[PDB]
């Protein structure tokens, strides 16, 4: 009973790096053990009235503070052995067919694609976790725990409680614009973009006053897309809302077998499209890599043969990244309970 | 299309070679292939014959410069260009053909020898390298010196793997160009750690600082492959066959006779073979008639025909090798079997087309680059004078000032009388000139004319009869 | 997602992935019609008398 | 043998092991043995 292989598709989770493109530009590789991030207070007292006779109270000059950071290391790997090449592959026609030498060059290609995708997912997760909260910890099984902790004031990452939560109060005769204004009052610098998780977008859009903000002849200049706009894509650029662009982000990363969402269940981020973002890459640490003469690079590839009885031709990529944020007070995170 | 299928009856099923570029199919096995070609060249009778034919026919005994700068583009004038050409030609002849061999650092060769060695290196290795350097301590007029760099000495630093920008010791930019070559030093005496040094392809001044000459095939080929890759396996197997046949003939003709008996091996050889008792030597003079008792016997073995068709199989393989390498069968094998005039002339023509192609590309480009590299110093040093009122100086148009042609030895005819009559017939009509006719014989016609006018005056002065060329 | 690994310790080899196949077979169909002159002798409905 | 060496002086080599981590080694080996054609053209006194 011969057969033919007419179609052989692929599957893919909705993955797209929004955060790492919008806020983290100008990558900075460094050939150094650790990096510094400095900030200066810049708060000046209002001058105090003094009699023309007293003539005292010399004021201190302001001085800043610094923080040191150390990057983590990641090295996914795959392999191919002569045992797997013999039988068949499900992307290959039962007719036609090729020698094992050709099947050696398919498993390798898809392997490299897989660890490249894993590195990209790690970069995206490390970028996203620095936005929602000022700090994240880099931990694992074979890796000693190292944490990076920018100084984000407690006034940010506002979370709603039993008082003033959008869900519990009614969907008519209320306006979320004042709540957005009050939340954004704690930011340092003009805000231009707002990121919604889909549940948060469905909760925000359902208000009746927001609809009137759209179809008023002279009371606004906003325009939105209340209807369905993007269904399969991981990003959704909806219209501007007064002056701040409204972007809905729903991406996926898979840790273990299951899928998970980057943005955690209706969180809102008040942010700026030009926030100073740092994309740092550490030094790669392999004897052959430094024998080439390359250091502080991203995605060093290599392969070898172990000479052992079943042979095997491995493959590895290693980056050692570190995603930082120079100004951690230009984003205001909201839980939206 | 049966070609891309299984085949006639599935005969080719196991013939599905992978589709890879020339770089991917050559670079992994570069050094081993080049070393095998070197082994064939240094230890086989036919390979050295092919290389000697390459050197002797492509270049020959003498290699001459002919300088024809483009005057119309430069707008300088006929006489100024001619005077410049004559002076620079004389300077080159008295720099290139110097007896001290000071053109190269090793002080071992002349210019023609350097070109011949370059052609040979292009033959059994696939490319040739030349480095042009300066030495301050040289107290002579022109200083630029040259060296031939072996391909083996050019390799990746630290023996690292191949990368996207540097493949097999050659750096490549985004496009296919080259920037600099890593040239190792090799120390035969006792070894050392080894060093890799950077030599840029061209100095920031545009001078040719490192020459790499080869003939590419595909879009991207960082380093070329030699000509033996077609027929290395056949030649090595042919050598094994020849040695085996020779040894087999020696061992078959060795055992002339055979003695069968039942006595002691000393008395048996005494009574039958006639050896003196005091193994047993036999004096080899006279005709002997032995006496044999019933048990004994004498047998004279017979060997096979020593060359039972082996010559014909050698003809087949040598014709294959001649097809591969490029030289004709008769020149490679020195057989020169019976053949008419037409056969010989046709074979000579098929060899000559290839030889002229190779000379016009490889040796000619090497010599042109070397000659340009010298002129610049001589121009910069004020040894020669550029014509005045020039549209360009030397730097803006290098190829304009140094457009030159090279003439070497010409063909030796099978019957030159016919060729001489050919040349005379063409000269009498208009289809050819004196320049092209004198070039086929490897002579510069202006030298001929100067000697001619000197000689007619010499003949007139002494009282001999006036010559044929003399003007009435 | 690529779990972190220290530069010293060797990382785990991650399994490659393989697909799944299914089988299908077609179905045959043949309509048929017949003409004999006894039907053509008379007059068709849409022909002018 | 792979590079045709025998009876030389202070032959160095530099290699990297193809393991899951990576380390780089460097080593020089030689076979020094000093001889005298005539063991007796010297007298060695221990003084006092």
UniProtKB/Swiss-Prot annotation, chain A:
Compartments it resides in: Virion; Host cytoplasm
Name this polypeptide is given: Major capsid protein
Organism: Escherichia phage lambda
Pfam family, one: Phage_cap_E
Biological role stated in the UniProt entry: Assembles to form an icosahedral capsid with a T=7 symmetry. The icosahedral capsid is about 60 nm in diameter and composed of 415 major capsid proteins. The assembly is primed by the interaction between capsid assembly protease and portal dodecamer, and major capsid proteins assemble cooperatively to form the procapsid with the help of capsid scaffolding protein. Major capsid protein forms hexons and pentons of the icosahedron. Viral genomic DNA is packaged into the procapsid through the portal vertex.
Cellular component, GO annotation: host cell cytoplasm; T=7 icosahedral viral capsid; viral capsid
Keywords: Capsid protein, Host cytoplasm, Late protein, T=7 icosahedral capsid protein, Virion
Family assignment from sequence similarity: Belongs to the lambda phage major capsid protein family.
Gene3D superfamilies assigned to the protein according to its UniProt record, in alphabetical order: capsid protein of prophage domain, putative capsid protein of prophage domain like
Subunit record text: Homomultimer. Interacts with FI protein.
Curated annotation (Swiss-Prot), chain B:
PTM comment, free text: Proteolytically cleaved by the viral protease during capsid maturation.
Alphabetized Pfam families for the sequence: Phage_portal_2
Gene Ontology MF term list: DNA binding; structural molecule activity
GO CC terms of this entry: viral portal complex
Subcellular location: Virion
Keyword DNA-binding among record annotations: yes
InterPro entries reported in the protein's UniProt record: Phage_lambda_portal
DNA-binding listed as a keyword: yes
Disulfide bonds: none
Keywords (A to Z) from UniProt: Capsid protein, DNA-binding, Viral capsid assembly, Viral genome ejection through host cell envelope, Viral genome packaging, Viral long flexible tail ejection system, Viral penetration into host cytoplasm, Viral release from host cell, Virion, Virus entry into host cell
Any GO BP annotation: symbiont genome ejection through host cell envelope, long flexible tail mechanism
Main subcellular location: virion
Function of the protein: Forms the portal vertex of the capsid. This portal plays critical roles in head assembly, genome packaging, neck/tail attachment, and genome ejection. The portal protein multimerizes as a single ring-shaped homododecamer arranged around a central channel. Binds to the terminase subunits to form the packaging machine.
Subunit structure: Homododecamer. Interacts with the terminase complex composed of two small and one large terminase subunits.
Family: Belongs to the siphoviridae portal protein family.
NCBIfam families for this protein: portal_lambda
Protein name per Swiss-Prot or TrEMBL: Portal protein B
Curated annotation (Swiss-Prot), chain C:
Compartments it resides in: Virion; Host cytoplasm
Complexes and interactors: Homomultimer. Interacts with FI protein.
Reported function: Assembles to form an icosahedral capsid with a T=7 symmetry. The icosahedral capsid is about 60 nm in diameter and composed of 415 major capsid proteins. The assembly is primed by the interaction between capsid assembly protease and portal dodecamer, and major capsid proteins assemble cooperatively to form the procapsid with the help of capsid scaffolding protein. Major capsid protein forms hexons and pentons of the icosahedron. Viral genomic DNA is packaged into the procapsid through the portal vertex.
Family indicated by similarity: Belongs to the lambda phage major capsid protein family.
Name recorded for this polypeptide: Major capsid protein
Organism encoding this protein: Escherichia phage lambda
Full-protein residues shown: 50 to 98 of 341
């Amino acid at each position: 009973t011969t057969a033919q292989l007419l179609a052989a598709n692929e599957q893919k989770f909705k993955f797209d790096p929004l955060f790492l493109r919008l806020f983290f530009r100008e990558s900075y590789p460094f050939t150094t053990e650790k990096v510094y991030l400095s900030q200066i207070p810049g708060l000046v007292n209002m001058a105090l009235y003094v009699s023309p006779i007293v003539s005292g109270e010399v004021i201190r000059s302001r001085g800043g503070s610094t923080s040191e950071f150390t990057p983590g290391y990641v090295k996914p790997k795959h392999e191919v052995n002569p045992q797997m090449t013999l039988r068949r592959l499900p992307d290959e026609d039962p007719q036609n067919l090729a020698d094992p030498a050709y099947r050696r060059r398919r498993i390798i290609m898809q392997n490299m694609r897989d660890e490249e995708l894993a590195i990209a997912q790690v970069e995206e997760m490390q970028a996203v976790s620095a936005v929602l909260k000022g700090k994240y910890t880099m931990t694992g099984e074979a890796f000693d725990p190292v944490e990076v902790d920018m100084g984000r004031s407690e006034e940010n990452n506002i979370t709603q409680s039993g008082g003033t939560e959008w869900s519990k109060r009614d969907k008519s005769t209320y306006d979320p614009t004042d709540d957005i204004e009050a939340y954004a009052l704690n930011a340092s610098g003009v805000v231009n973009i707002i990121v919604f998780d889909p549940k948060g977008w469905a909760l925000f859009r359902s208000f009746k006053a927001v609809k009137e903000k759209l179809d008023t002849r002279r009371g606004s200049n906003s325009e939105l897309e209340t209807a369905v706009k993007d269904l399969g894509k991981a990003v959704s650029y909806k219209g501007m809302y007064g002056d701040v662009a409204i972007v809905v982000y729903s991406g996926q990363y898979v840790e273990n077998g299951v899928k998970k969402n980057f943005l955690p269940d209706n969180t809102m981020v008040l942010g700026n499209t030009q926030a100073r973002g740092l994309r740092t890459y550490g030094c790669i640490q392999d004897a052959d890599a430094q024998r080439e003469g390359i250091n502080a690079s991203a995605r060093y590839p290599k392969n070898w043969v172990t000479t052992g009885d079943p042979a095997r031709e491995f493959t590895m990529i290693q980056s050692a990244p570190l995603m930082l944020l120079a100004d951690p007070d230009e984003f205001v995170s909201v839980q939206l309970a | 299309y049966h070609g891309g299928g299984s085949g006639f009856g599935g005969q080719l099923r196991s013939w599905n070679p992978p589709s890879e570029s020339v770089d991917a199919a050559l670079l992994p096995n570069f050094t081993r292939g080049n070393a095998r070609a070197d082994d064939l060249v240094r230890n086989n009778g036919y390979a050295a014959n092919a290389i000697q034919l390459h050197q002797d026919h492509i270049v020959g005994s003498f290699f001459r410069l002919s300088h024809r700068p483009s005057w119309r583009y430069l707008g300088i004038g006929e006489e100024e260009a001619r005077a410049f050409s004559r002076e620079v030609e004389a300077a080159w002849k008295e720099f290139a053909e110097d007896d001290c061999c000071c053109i190269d650092v090793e002080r071992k060769r002349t210019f023609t020898m350097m070109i011949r060695e370059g052609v040979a290196m292009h033959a059994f290795n696939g490319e040739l390298f030349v480095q042009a350097t300066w030495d301050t301590s040289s107290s002579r007029l022109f200083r630029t010196q040259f060296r031939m760099v072996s391909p083996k000495r050019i390799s990746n630093p630290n023996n690292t793997g191949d990368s996207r920008n540097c493949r097999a010791g050659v750096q490549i930019n985004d496009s296919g160009a080259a920037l600099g070559y890593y040239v190792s030093e090799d120390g035969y005496p006792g070894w050392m750690p080894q060093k890799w040094t950077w030599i840029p392809r061209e100095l920031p001044g545009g001078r040719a600082s490192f020459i790499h000459v080869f003939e590419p095939v595909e879009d991207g080929q960082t380093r070329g492959a030699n000509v033996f890759y077609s027929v290395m396996e056949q030649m090595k197997m042919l050598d094994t066959l020849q040695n085996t046949q020779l040894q087999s003939a020696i061992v078959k003709a060795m055992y002339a006779a055979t003695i069968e008996s039942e006595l002691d091996t000393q008395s048996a050889m005494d009574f039958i073979l006639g050896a003196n008792s005091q193994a047993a030597p036999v004096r080899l003079g006279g005709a002997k008639v032995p006496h044999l008792m019933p048990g004994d016997s004498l047998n004279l073995q017979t060997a096979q025909d020593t060359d039972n068709g082996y010559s014909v199989f050698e003809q087949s393989l040598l014709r294959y090798i001649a097809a591969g390498l490029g030289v004709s069968y008769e020149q490679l094998s020195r057989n020169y079997a019976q053949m008419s005039y037409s056969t010989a002339r046709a074979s000579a023509n098929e060899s000559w087309a290839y030889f002229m192609g190779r000379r016009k590309f490889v040796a000619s480009r090497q010599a042109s680059q070397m000659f340009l590299c010298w002129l610049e110093e001589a121009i910069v040093r004020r040894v020669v004078t550029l014509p005045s009122k020039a549209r360009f100086s030397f730097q803006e148009a290098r190829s304009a000032w140094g457009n030159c042609d090279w003439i070497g030895s010409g063909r030796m005819a099978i019957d030159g009388l016919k060729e001489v009559q050919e040349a005379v017939m063409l000269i009498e009509a208009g289809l050819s000139t004196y320049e092209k006719e004198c070039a086929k014989r490897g002579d510069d016609y202006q030298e001929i004319f100067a000697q001619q006018v000197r000689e007619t005056m010499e003949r007139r002065a002494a009282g001999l009869k006036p010559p044929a060329w003399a003007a009435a």
